[PDB]
Design a protein around this motif. Structure first.
Motif, PDB file in Angstrom:
ATOM      1  N   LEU A  84      -9.325  -6.838   5.213  1.00 29.16           N
ATOM      2  CA  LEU A  84      -9.288  -7.226   3.801  1.00 29.16           C
ATOM      3  C   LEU A  84      -7.991  -6.722   3.176  1.00 29.16           C
ATOM      4  N   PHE A  85      -7.663  -5.441   3.360  1.00 27.98           N
ATOM      5  CA  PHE A  85      -6.412  -4.953   2.819  1.00 27.98           C
ATOM      6  C   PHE A  85      -5.204  -5.663   3.428  1.00 27.98           C
ATOM      7  N   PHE A  86      -5.274  -5.975   4.718  1.00 30.84           N
ATOM      8  CA  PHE A  86      -4.208  -6.702   5.396  1.00 30.84           C
ATOM      9  C   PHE A  86      -3.985  -8.047   4.734  1.00 30.84           C
TER      10      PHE A  86
ATOM     11  N   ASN B 219      -0.968  -2.080   0.528  1.00 34.53           N
ATOM     12  CA  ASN B 219      -2.109  -2.727   1.165  1.00 34.53           C
ATOM     13  C   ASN B 219      -2.015  -2.699   2.676  1.00 34.53           C
TER      14      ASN B 219
ATOM     15  N   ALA C 219      -4.829  -8.999   1.703  1.00 35.17           N
ATOM     16  CA  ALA C 219      -4.300  -8.785   0.383  1.00 35.17           C
ATOM     17  C   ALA C 219      -2.788  -8.599   0.443  1.00 35.17           C
TER      18      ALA C 219
END
Ligand SMILES: CCCCCCCCO[C@@H]1O[C@H](CO)[C@@H](O)[C@H](O)[C@H]1O
Ligand SMILES: CCCCCCCCO[C@@H]1O[C@H](CO)[C@@H](O)[C@H](O)[C@H]1O
Ligand SMILES: CCCCCCCCO[C@@H]1O[C@H](CO)[C@@H](O)[C@H](O)[C@H]1O
Ligand SMILES: CCCCCCCCO[C@@H]1O[C@H](CO)[C@@H](O)[C@H](O)[C@H]1O
Ligand SMILES: CCCCCCCCO[C@@H]1O[C@H](CO)[C@@H](O)[C@H](O)[C@H]1O
Ligand SMILES: CCCCCCCCO[C@@H]1O[C@H](CO)[C@@H](O)[C@H](O)[C@H]1O
Ligand SMILES: CCCCCCCCO[C@@H]1O[C@H](CO)[C@@H](O)[C@H](O)[C@H]1O
Ligand SMILES: CCCCCCCCO[C@@H]1O[C@H](CO)[C@@H](O)[C@H](O)[C@H]1O
Ligand SMILES: CCCCCCCCO[C@@H]1O[C@H](CO)[C@@H](O)[C@H](O)[C@H]1O
Ligand SMILES: CCCCCCCCO[C@@H]1O[C@H](CO)[C@@H](O)[C@H](O)[C@H]1O
Ligand SMILES: CCCCCCCCO[C@@H]1O[C@H](CO)[C@@H](O)[C@H](O)[C@H]1O
Ligand SMILES: CCCCCCCCO[C@@H]1O[C@H](CO)[C@@H](O)[C@H](O)[C@H]1O
Lengths: 313, 313, 313
Positions: free
Chosen positions: C168-170, C150, C172
């Protein structure tokens, strides 16, 4: 006749007005952009409030006439958590009613805040005495008293203008979430849940979305780095739970699926803030539509069950 | 005569100068508002420093003449943690002395910082080799080397002007806290603690309050969203521990209750910042008064025990 | 001849191009200050890319001709995690190639992002069904699909200009890290790892440093309070792992030590941002030099093993 019989309203059914009330509030927060949203919000809000009144009266009857049944749920290290739905929904109905009568709304918000804080202070802490809670008690429902109730107080107190007090409840909920989830997910990996409890997997959707919705309530919809971070983990969990859904419903669709409605409604609510902040607008539209469709399906399933005499016990 | 006898100063007694020193610093941070606070701060600080000198000399004697007793506490996966009180208190006495002699203060702060970091690097990491620490070793005392020591370095280094280095220690402590607490609270739910260890439940009060006090030291008392979040969880834990207090002291009041003084004193210290920031001033006054009364009671209990010949072993 | 034989490329060998690629990117981020860094970055990047191409082709051959071997690693609740190295490295090679061909880079970044998210959605979530993952499955390798993948998407998407998607990935990754680590470290304390898995202790170095590197990628190198906090915990873990190193390599130096390269390379990368932000410049220089020396030693060890015919199985 029966010597005893489980009360016809399971405590968990308070998840129905929870989901509807929270969804009302999501639509309320679209009135800025699309005035017709207010009508949708008001209808949801009235329905949620009516259901809540009914269920409150039902639970008062349970307390008066079937007190030992309440006592057993209260002392259970698993079932106690559902009782937190009562003050949570009380607060959410207050938030709805604020649009029409801020005085009555404020009374409900304080009752629910004091109630939930007393409840956790009495019961969540008691677990730390050991010997009652077991490894198998590590269920998603624990999020209700420990996490959701605090976030609900946070946003309801902010609505009343008590932002700094709201931040205290917000922090309590956010740190409690991060402190519980590690052990929950490890437990699910090793042991999981039996089918009878699996619908409560839906509560795993809730934390990040309820957290960000409360955060944005306090901070006037400012979509900042924390908000984006929370959404990211929230969507990760959504994807995971979507993949798990056939397993969750292995033994059939049931009313327990209202467990998902706290996260779904808060997905909708927070989407309104992202949209208005011009952050990830496409994702926002998707999230808002998805969560409404999902909750819509829960409503249709519930009407079907009522229609068939398979709602109350 | 005895072949052997436990050393008269239990290592945990370093919690006494810890609580008094931290409380000195809280009063110091009120001098801005109420100059008479300085007198109270100086008296607390002198008393804390004198007790610390005594206990340091006592522990040096233990090291010289009863080394195997130190070795056994050091290698214990539970008892090692109390040794961290030594560098923690060394740092706090440095912070006090800074008002009178910044050179000596700086020496003490570096000794305590290097000491605590060496200690954790040697012992906390060693636990990850497995087979020595057991599930039953999961005690609140672990917060001392893992969390409290880093926060103390953070604020002491900030006092000396090393804010960015302070933030490194702050982050180490904050993330270590969030990483340990999940497993601690799960353990307490399932197994709890035996009465002989229950007073150490007071250390559970410490993390959020010590964290926010260190944070506010580095950031010049700016009461921001993080600070409010930390206070909220801190008060949640306070409520929980208040409810648990009769259970904590089931077998009687004892000197171990000084375990609470790290959180109490940091409640007081952080309250001075909230008050001065005009955030939750009423809560701040309550917190400051409460924590002083509590620590006052610990002092009176301790004088009573000394008076009766029931302090040292 | 053999009826069956383990495939000559262990999946974990994708850690080699990972470490080299990430180190390429660290040097790239020094070109602003020292133009000669670009040459070093380009050489590392080309080498990493060539190794990655080879290993991708090798793994494609494994998939085609030894599919049941892939299937068994995929379904293992421990070994599945190493497969995440494939999309991680795909993304990192994309980041390298962006300097020369943004179109091809973008294709690789999306393939790796979609791939890793699909992979976790399929497998990480499946663990929550219970009964397959065991307590003994709680290994540092879990960080690869859950956390590192992520963070890599976060920084790669930011490179492409998708900062909000990157956040968002961060989020997660960051929340997944904090949610897993508690149970990992408790497991290591109680049970640890057998020698054959101990080199994977190096992955414990990664989270804080990979986290801060991704954060600084998204936020244009702004070294703020969060960044400093992350570095502090990262250095704590570095100290712990340095102390543990003789134990980690009790049974000898081996190629598994490439496990450390994700944290080492991200230490280097984040150091370039701290240096350029004029935050802890001395620490930054140390970190950059240390991590380069370490990875240099891994490279020399690897050449030695290749030279001796002891690299591939
Ligand atoms: C939502 C409300 C839930 C409250 C459940 C209360 C549980 C009460 O608990 C009981 O109280 C009794 C007295 O009435 C005592 O006799 C019992 O010791 C105690 O079990
Ligand atoms: C939603 C608000 C519910 C609060 C009502 C709880 C009052 C019950 O009474 C309290 O309950 C305890 C809980 O552990 C029992 O041990 C004791 O009776 C008492 O502390
Ligand atoms: C458990 C995960 C917690 C992550 C908290 C994120 C830290 C706060 O993030 C902050 O956001 C601010 C406003 O967007 C920025 O100005 C700061 O640069 C940034 O550090
Ligand atoms: C939280 C998400 C709910 C908001 C849904 C809004 C959908 C409106 O749709 C948007 O309308 C805009 C004009 O108003 C157009 O510019 C956009 O192209 C269109 O996508
Ligand atoms: C506050 C100081 C605590 C230090 C305790 C040290 C524990 C020492 O440990 C011992 O050191 C001995 C040598 O002196 C060795 O013989 C032993 O292997 C080792 O147990
Ligand atoms: C407060 C500062 C105390 C630091 C002194 C510790 C020195 C003891 O010596 C060290 O102790 C080890 C710890 O695991 C033993 O295994 C070894 O003797 C050595 O590493
Ligand atoms: C484990 C809980 C960590 C929560 C960290 C909170 C994230 C930081 O909170 C930040 O505070 C800033 C200053 O007040 C604001 O400007 C930002 O909008 C806000 O995101
Ligand atoms: C951390 C809390 C310690 C500070 C205690 C301050 C109590 C002073 O009391 C305050 O004095 C103010 C004038 O100075 C008045 O305006 C307020 O009404 C009064 O509450
Ligand atoms: C990097 C790629 C890893 C993919 C591993 C796939 C694991 C496949 O899994 C298998 O798929 C089969 C069909 O081909 C089914 O027969 C099996 O039920 C299932 O085990
Ligand atoms: C790096 C990207 C790899 C993705 C390929 C996985 C496709 C395998 O196929 C999928 O695998 C499942 C995983 O639990 C199996 O149960 C089923 O075959 C299917 O869901
Ligand atoms: C798990 C640990 C998460 C810690 C997140 C730290 C909270 C964010 O820290 C914030 O940083 C901002 C920029 O530096 C400052 O302006 C704010 O005052 C500060 O609260
Ligand atoms: C991430 C760390 C890599 C950067 C290494 C830079 C080392 C350069 O060294 C620095 O050069 C400066 C002038 O440019 C001098 O002012 C400093 O004294 C010197 O330390």
């Amino acid at each position: 006749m029966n010597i005893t019989k489980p009360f016809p309203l399971p405590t968990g059914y308070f998840g129905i007005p929870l989901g509807l009330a929270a969804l009302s509030l999501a639509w309320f927060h679209l009135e800025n952009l699309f005035p017709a949203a207010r009508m949708v919000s008001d209808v949801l809000g009235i329905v949620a409030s009516a259901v809540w009144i009914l269920f409150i009266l039902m639970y008062a009857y349970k307390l008066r006439y079937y007190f030992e049944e309440v006592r057993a749920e209260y002392h259970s290290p698993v079932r106690f958590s559902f009782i937190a739905l009562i003050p949570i929904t009380t607060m959410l109905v207050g938030d709805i009613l604020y649009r029409w009568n801020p005085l009555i709304a404020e009374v409900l918000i304080w009752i629910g805040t004091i109630g939930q804080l007393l409840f956790s202070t009495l019961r969540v802490s008691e677990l730390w005495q050991g010997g009652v809670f077991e490894q198998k008690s590590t269920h998603p429902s624990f999020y209700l008293p420990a996490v959701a109730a605090n976030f609900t107080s946070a946003s309801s107190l902010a609505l009343l203008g008590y932002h700094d007090l709201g931040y205290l409840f917000f922090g309590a909920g956010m740190i409690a979430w991060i402190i519980f989830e590690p052990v929950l997910l490890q437990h699910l990996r090793i042991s999981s849940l039996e089918p009878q409890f699996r619908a409560t997997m839906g509560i795993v959707l809730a934390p990040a979305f309820v957290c960000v919705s409360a955060y944005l309530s306090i901070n006037h919809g400012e979509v900042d780095t924390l908000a984006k971070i929370l959404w990211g983990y929230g969507f990760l969990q959504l994807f995971f739970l979507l993949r798990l859904f056939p397993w969750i419903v292995e033994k059939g669709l049931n009313i327990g699926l209202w467990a998902f409605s706290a996260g779904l409604a808060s997905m909708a609510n927070s989407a309104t803030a992202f949209y208005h902040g011009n952050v990830l607008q496409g994702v926002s539209i998707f999230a808002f539509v998805f969560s409404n469709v999902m909750i819509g399906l829960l409503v249709l399933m519930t009407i079907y069950k009522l229609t068939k005499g398979q709602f109350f016990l």
